[model samples]
Target: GKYLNRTINILNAGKNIAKSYGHNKLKPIHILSALAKSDYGSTLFKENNVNAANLKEYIDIALEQTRAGAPLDNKSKIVNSAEVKETLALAEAAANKYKSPKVDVEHLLSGLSNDELVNEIFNEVYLTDEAIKAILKRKFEKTLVPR
Candidate 1:
């Protein structure tokens, strides 16, 4: 399995984002936003016809909007939201489907496709999840080694 150094960094950034925001829990948006900071994730976004800069701005906007109704967890410590965990699960499955031994940036992008928060951000950028997936699948095919 390939070491997910970049993804791990994003996840760690998610925690840092949460802490900086004074939030106890790391939400799906945090992870998505953090991932967007990566070159791999940015390239995926560009491939989908969404400007990475625009996408990032929207993510920034989302954070503010998200904070408005966010719940107060039992304590102020970093923790993943259920949505984030589900997205990661989807990433792992997508990675397998891509015939890859490890979950990489593309896999995580696929996983985020179905998320409401992420979807809305996509919509704002006029990027369709299906369009993104189509391109991703095509790219995957190029690199996928059939097992």
Candidate 2:
């Protein structure tokens, strides 16, 4: 058992965002936005030489676009969208791949990185999936080693 605090918070935050937008399902955009707002997300941004605020702005714009078309029934309860489910499965896979004792921000981000919209925004900021994974791997390894 290890810390999965931020990951839990991110899921709740993403659900809240979906509910606020009158969406019946938690979408990839919602999760991406949530992850982008996380502490380790800021660290990832800094390592990649990108501005976190600017990246968040782009995600916000995408969120607006998501709400522009067919809005979900306000009365309907929120559930995980297909993509969100897939992303989470990928996140779990990431943890397994890295042999991590617990799922963390890196795993969550790795999951989101597979989203088309997420990848597009990352490309705009000059970030690649492989590069993101590489950086996160180093960071994850560092956390495991005692100083």
Candidate 3:
């Protein structure tokens, strides 16, 4: 609900990815791809030493497994896959728990942490919750400083 502009753009990208991939459901993997493509997420991955091509290939394989064989209608409304809905809900909780003014990429990553696919991707890239929270904590502390 308190999604930041970057988060919103990622959501839009997720929808486009779903359409391109012929996935009727905009799953967490799709969202993850969107996140991977975003500058915000790219910076996080860079800090963690995650190879961009490696991550994209990982996501591409996961996406292939979810294909429906037919692309979604361009103008049609794309529905959020169950997992994505749950991820967003968890992201909201993370936002509140961390006291972030708006839900951002870090919150989304925290939400995706529990997902099996995400677990595999994160593990492969050596991304951990502690690492994510480190960023989250920094953002939380930043909010406390006078602008």
Candidate 4:
């Protein structure tokens, strides 16, 4: 409810940012950062015992480790290039297969669920796999309902 709305707002903000940057597509990192800064984002971090400072630090550490060419731990693993491409392809295929015009969060979530790295991030960010799957199922059912 409230959290979901907050997430939507954050997503909208991220979309705006993407448009401003002249990026036709919104990247996962953009959405994640927006969610972290939204009202629900704050609550999510608090609920997960992650403060803003800690979250920033974690991201910084990840970047630093990457820059240094160091192997990161499981939690620090970001979605790699191949994974991103595959996830996007999966999302596109899912949308096409369902005969939908554009991909939505349900399709994106489904794509992420198929990726170990992205799914782990989703779980860590409090977006449980079960919850995402349930949303996808609900959306799918709703799409089948007559207008």
Candidate 5:
């Protein structure tokens, strides 16, 4: 889908930026900011009724919060290693194959559930597949409104 392509491009751009910054891995903020500034960003922002300014602000806050609490590592906290890149690639491939308009959180979740690297990361983070699925199901239901 156009949106997923846009997201991939943005993510690649972020990866480049991280590389230029002498960082071995890309961080979540890098991905988020890239997505926000990409063409599909406007669509997602509008669909979610998110204000760009506020969204950027929130992204900054989220970065700060995570940085403050995250464990110190030699690599980027977000994209800690090559495994993360592989997981993200799997997610991108799946999203493209599904022809999804946007790479929804569910897509990421699904990719994580299957990919060994992502699965390890999920386990390390204490995120269980069953729990993730339940949360996604609840969110999916909430996204729909009764007529």
Candidate 6:
């Protein structure tokens, strides 16, 4: 499956976000920061009436609390946190919801149901099934994210 540049940027940012903290592994929060930095990604939070700014700040605080073991070499293979893996698995499922072999920002946004800080900030959005379906109009689909 191919990724849109929007997602590519988020992933690339995750590596740098981890390295900047001298952490060898990428955490769920790092992924969140990368997503929050993007307009398309932040739409996930905004549509749910979640304050993207607040969530970003909350994650930033948590990231600040994370202990970094050592600075990673650029060549160091980046690893995902257990939580991130779970989130991605869920994202896979989200894509499957549409029978899409290709994952999109829509799936990535919906798959993060278990992110603790996310729920803390995104709480009560009540993103109902109808609401989600409404969002998946495929207006952007694979073409929405920048090339």
Error of 1 at 95 (Å): 0.7
Model 2 Cα shift for residue 58 (angstroms): 1.0
Candidate 4: lDDT of 64? 36
Candidate 5 lDDT (Cα, 0 to 1): 0.54
What are the per-residue Cα lDDT tens digits for candidate 5 across 70-135? 333434433545645555665566555555546664455455456553344445435577765554
Q: Comparing candidate 2 with candidate 5, which one achieves the higher lDDT?
A: 2
Cα lDDT tens digits for candidate 2, 32-141? 78777777667767877777878988999989988834545556578898998898888888887777767788788888889999889888887788787886678667
**Per-candidate local distance difference test:** 0.76, 0.80, 0.85, 0.52, 0.54, 0.68
Q: Put down candidate 6 lDDT per residue, 1-147, tens digits, no spaces.
A: 545566667877977888877777777677767777777877776866666656766778777887485667777777787877887888777777765567767776666545775554445445454555656555345444635
Top candidate by TM-score: 3
Report how far residue 56 has shifted in candidate 4, in Å. 9.0
Residue pairs in collision within model 1: none
Alpha carbon deviation, residue 79, candidate 1 (Å): 1.5
Backbone clash numbers for all candidates listed: 0, 0, 0, 0, 0, 0
lDDT of 1 at 20: 62
**In model 2, which runs have C-alpha deviations exceeding 4 angstroms?**
1-3, 68-76, 145-147
- lDDT per residue for candidate 1 within 72-121, as digits (tens), equals 45355687778878988888888787676777777777788778888888
The residue ranges of model 1 lying beyond 4 angstroms of the native Cα positions read 1-3, 68-76, 145-147
**Could you tell me the TM-score of candidate 5?**
0.46
Each model's TM-score, in the order given? Answer: 0.82, 0.85, 0.89, 0.45, 0.46, 0.71
- Worst 10-residue stretch by lDDT in candidate 2? 68-77
At residue 146, candidate 2 shows an lDDT of 45
TM-score of candidate 6 versus the correct structure, residues matched by position: 0.71
Per-residue accuracy of model 4 over 1-147 as CA lDDT, tens digit each:
212344356656655544443444554544545555666556645654545775555444432332433333423323234554576577666655555556654454456456664455555545676765566565667787656
Report the lDDT of model 5 for residue 57: 68
